[PDB]
Structures are given as structure tokens and as C-alpha cells.
Design a protein that fits this description.
Layout: E1 5-8, E2 13-16, H1 24-32, E3 38-40, H2 54-61, E4 65-70, E5 76-81, H3 82-86, E6 106-108, H4 117-120, H5 122-129, H6 135-138, E7 162-166, E8 180-183, E9 188-197, H7 206-215, H8 220-227, E10 233-239, H9 245-258, H10 269-272, H11 279-289, E11 294-299, E12 303-306, E13 312-316, E14 319-327
Parallel strand pairs: 2-3
Antiparallel strand pairs: 1-2, 3-12, 4-5, 4-6, 6-7, 7-14, 8-13, 9-12, 9-14, 10-11, 10-13
The chain binds chloride ion (4 copies) and manganese (II) ion.
One chloride ion binds next to loops.
Subcellular location: Nucleus
Organism: Homo sapiens (Human)
Domain JmjC: 121-340
Length: 340
């Protein structure tokens, strides 16, 4: 039976089932005012699937110049062609190689660049914006988005959306690395998984994805979405409540000291965007500071709602295309105010 919603993270996470249900707002707002993230599944069934394929990005835009990041070590690969990234998205042997002769795990930095998404890709822009869930919150002019309505006393988000493209992390050592390191935004965000690429050549990588989800501390209902329904998993997220940000700063100041970093006692390890919380650091954050997070697996078509001020990190299990829009809900507008 088609149902309106379910719960993940043992009841701590709302999962809405129909992205276009006009009554979503009634369940959504109860959870959102309490500072929780929310998941909406099925957005991929609303989209034109041919507009979101790696092969088509390569053909249409492959000649543009870009920088990439080597996710394993943060090294910047400068001034290459965007086809150099896309033609290795799913075929491993076509990937740029590091000195060691290994195929690199790469992230495409700032593409499309700045606020250029709509100008470069007007048809993708339309397909996405017309199908975002909770549209009164998420559309540029929605009645519950204050982005277009606030004076300069508030930090207003850029015109989006923004596109997040990166390979999947592979090995046992990769389990300790992030696609996007622990950070926080002053605006709310909605992030949609539009494409998951499962590679080939070194295809038969199914078993280390399971250990990563397991060690990622993912709930039993989430492991059931793989083993029973055969959905494509994209990324492992950890999100923490905005109210826990300072305790996370205290932990990362202590661990920095232990690892011989030399930092002024007020410096902000979350704004630095230099940390990924592996299993050891998450266990410590729980035991030593009493802080619990949400572990979330974003499958193809899953929309993840991130509250303003909430520290979060992302780890791609396979190759992903994500598109994200920033917005300013009344529930969380305190987080972008420039005074007190
Ligand atoms: Cl809040
Ligand atoms: Cl387009
Ligand atoms: Cl709505
Ligand atoms: Cl990062
Ligand atoms: Mn973010």
C-alpha cells in the first residue's frame, strides 16, 4: 500500500513518500521547527532522466576549463577540460592517475561556476525547480521562503541551484575520507540525488559499500532499502543539530591539539572545513560530549533537507550528481541574522 510517510533513524527522521503531495507541509513543519533534517523519496520519477546523464554533460559542455580536487589528499588538479572528469565518471580505467599509478577519486569544483547554473543550463533549471518538494519553502518566490524579502541585516543566499559532482570512494582507507568535509550553512538547503553511477572494470565493489554503511551507523530499515527493494545508494551523510555545533568545535580543538596542530584557542574547526568524522571521532563525540547525529543514506531521487546551522558531511558510496537549492524558512531565520 502507497503510504504518505515512514520513519528512519529509529523514528528520529521523517521520510515523505510523494514529492508532489499538496499536504506534505502539515507533517513537515512539525519536524522542521524542532531542528530536524527531513528526507523526501521519489523525486527522480518527476524528472526527465535524459537531462541528468554524465554522457550528455560531457557532449554539451566537455570543452569548458575547470579545476578538480583529489578527494584522498585535497590536492588541486588545475585548468583541465570538464570531459576529463565526465568520461571517467563510470569507466574506471579512463580516470586521471596519481603518481602511485592509481585511478584518482575526484570532485568537480565549482561547476557550473558561481550563479551561472540557470544561464548555462536553462532546461535543467526548469526540470529541477518545477519538481522540488515543499515548494512554498523551496521555490525562489515561495510564500515561506524569506530569501527575496529580508534586509541587509540578514545574510541572503546566492541564486542557485548549485551542482555537486564527484566519484565514489572505493577502498578501506577511503572509509575515513569525505567527499564534502564537516561544515554548516547559514541558510536552509534541499539537496536532490539526480544520478548514481555504479562503475565497471573494477565492478564487483558491492561488499565494501555494505561495511561503510554498517560502520557509518545506518539503521536497519535503511539496510532493508538495499537488500529488498534494490534501490541505488549514492552518499552516506552525517547531520548534527545546530544546537550541538559548539560541542563539535570543542572535540575538534582537543583532537587538533592531540595531533600536534598549533591553533589559537578560539579558531573554528567547522568553518575551516578541514575535518571528516570517521567511526572513531563519531563514537568519541557521543561518549565524551553526549552528542548524537543522524546517519542518512541518500538513494537515487532522495531529497535531503538540511536545517540552517546544522553541521554536516557527505561520503559518496558511488559516483553522484547532486543539485541543491538554498532557502530561508521562517523557522530558522535567526541563523542568518548579523547582530547579537
Ligand atoms: Cl534552530
Ligand atoms: Cl539545459
Ligand atoms: Cl509546501
Ligand atoms: Cl570539503
Ligand atoms: Mn552544505
Amino acid at each position: 500500500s502507497m503510504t504518505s510517510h515512514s520513519w528512519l533513524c529509529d523514528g528520529r527522521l521523517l521520510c515523505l513518500h510523494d514529492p508532489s503531495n499538496k499536504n506534505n507541509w502539515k507533517i513537515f513543519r512539525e519536524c522542521w521547527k524542532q531542528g530536524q533534517p527531513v528526507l523526501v523519496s521519489g523525486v527522480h520519477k518527476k524528472l526527465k532522466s535524459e537531462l541528468w546523464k554524465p554522457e550528455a554533460f560531457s557532449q554539451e559542455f566537455g570543452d569548458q576549463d575547470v579545476d578538480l580536487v583529489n578527494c584522498r589528499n585535497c590536492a588541486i588538479i588545475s585548468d583541465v577540460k570538464v570531459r576529463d572528469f565526465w568520461d571517467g565518471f563510470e569507466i574506471i580505467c579512463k580516470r586521471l592517475r596519481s603518481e602511485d599509478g592509481q585511478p584518482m577519486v575526484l570532485k568537480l569544483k565549482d561547476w557550473p561556476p558561481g550563479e551561472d547554473f540557470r544561464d548555462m543550463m536553462p532546461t535543467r533549471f526548469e526540470d529541477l525547480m518545477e519538481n522540488l518538494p515543499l515548494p512554498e519553502y523551496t521555490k525562489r518566490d515561495g510564500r515561506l521562503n524569506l530569501a527575496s524579502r529580508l534586509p541587509s541585516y540578514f545574510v541572503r543566499p546566492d541564486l542557485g541551484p548549485k551542482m555537486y559532482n564527484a566519484y565514489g570512494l572505493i577502498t578501506a582507507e577511503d572509509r575515513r575520507v569525505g567527499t564534502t568535509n564537516l561544515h554548516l550553512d547559514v541558510s536552509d538547503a534541499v539537496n536532490v540525488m539526480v544520478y548514481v553511477g555504479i562503475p565497471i572494470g573494477e565492478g564487483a565493489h558491492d561488499e565494501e559499500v555494505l561495511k561503510t554503511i554498517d560502520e557509518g551507523d545506518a539503521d536497519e530499515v535503511t539496510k532493508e532499502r538495499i537488500h529488498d527493494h534494490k534501490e541505488k545508494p549514492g552518499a552516506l551523510w552525517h547531520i548534527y543539530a545546530a544546537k550541538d555545533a559548539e560541542k563539535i568545535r570543542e572535540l575538534l580543538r582537543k583532537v587538533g591539539e592531540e595531533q600536534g596542530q598549533e591553533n589559537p584557542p578560539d579558531h573554528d574547526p567547522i568553518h575551516d572545513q578541514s575535518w571528516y568524522l570517521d567511526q572513531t571521532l563519531r563514537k568519541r563525540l557521543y561518549e565524551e560530549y553526549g552528542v548524537q547525529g543522524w546517519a542518512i543514506v541518500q538513494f537515487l531521487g532522495d531529497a535531503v533537507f538540511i536545517p540552517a546551522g546544522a553541521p554536516h558531511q557527505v561520503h559518496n558510496l558511488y559516483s553522484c550528481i547532486k543539485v541543491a537549492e538554498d532557502f530561508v524558512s521562517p523557522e530558522h531565520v535567526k541563523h542568518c541574522f548579523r547582530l547579537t
